[PDB]
């Protein structure tokens, strides 16, 4: 009985996601809502994404450079600079600035629609919310996560190059020539898969929590907080699983 309580919400989320997939592959797509939600997520989670990605990659590059300079092998730093940035820094900054901003925004928007009885207004008009609202939001979440992951990886690599060369006086040719030493097609492919899955899961969780808001006076805030916590936990677990799968393939081996 103790496990049966969260299992009901788990089943509701899973059934809602199954219906979302069915509406995506069966019913006509909502291009207008998809465009609107894509631009909304981009405008709500682009500047924070850079503002979190730039200092974090600078910190990682600084730590790697000092540790390797003491180690003596300061010419292979770019290798690590690539290896983290493609496979962990990109998807994890995507996790943070998607779950914090876009997932919470989707949950708040759908909760606002629910408490204002707009969902019931759609439902009494014969329309299905899962096809008109959830599908464009999940697709927009996936698209924005993909693009943001690409931008994060690129900006992180460039910032690491500039910091290491112009501050810690490492050699630029060693940075650019060692980037591909440990990173190849498997790493960028697993990064793309991570970003796509993270965006899809964040969109699904945000939509499901927004549709099932409790109203009241703290229901929307509680729903947003629960959305954020669930997204962080689920995306970290999925990142662990996908990291294991990706290192099973490997560029070095």
């Amino acid at each position: 009985g103790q496990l049966e309580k969260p299992l009901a919400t788990v089943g509701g989320f899973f059934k809602m996601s199954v219906m979302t997939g069915k509406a995506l592959f069966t019913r006509p797509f909502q291009w207008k809502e998809f465009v609107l939600q894509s631009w909304f997520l981009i405008r709500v989670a682009f500047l924070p994404t850079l503002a979190v990605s730039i200092p974090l990659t600078v910190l990682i590059i600084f730590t790697l450079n000092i540790l390797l300079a003491e180690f003596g092998a300061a010419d292979v730093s770019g290798a690590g600079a690539a290896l983290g940035a493609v496979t962990q820094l990109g998807p994890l900054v995507t996790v943070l600035v998607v779950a914090g901003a876009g997932s919470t925004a989707i949950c708040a928007d759908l909760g606002a629609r629910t408490v204002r009885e707009e969902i019931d207004a759609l439902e009494v008009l014969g329309i299905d919310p899962i096809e008109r609202l959830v599908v464009p939001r999940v697709v927009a979440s996936t698209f924005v996560a993909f693009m943001l992951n690409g931008a994060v990886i690129t900006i992180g690599l460039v910032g690491g190059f500039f910091f290491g060369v112009y501050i810690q006086n490492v050699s630029a040719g060693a940075y650019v020539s060692t980037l591909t030493l440990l990173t190849g097609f498997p790493e960028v492919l697993i990064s793309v898969v991570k970003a796509t899955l993270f965006g899809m899961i964040a969109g699904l969780v945000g939509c499901y929590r927004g549709l099932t808001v409790a109203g009241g006076s703290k229901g929307v805030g509680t729903a947003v907080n629960e959305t954020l916590v669930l997204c962080v936990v689920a995306l970290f677990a999925v990142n662990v699983v996908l990291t294991t799968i990706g290192v099973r393939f490997g560029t070095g081996r």
């Binding site: 709500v44 914090g100 901003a101 925004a105 708040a108 909760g111 947003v224």
Partner: peptide, 21 residues
């Protein structure tokens, strides 16, 4: 009202991420 609390939570989360890093 209750709607603005969620938006406040989202904005606070963005600012917190930036400040921590």
């Amino acid at each position: 009202g209750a709607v603005g609390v969620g938006e406040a939570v989202g904005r606070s989360m963005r600012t917190s991420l930036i400040a921590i890093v």
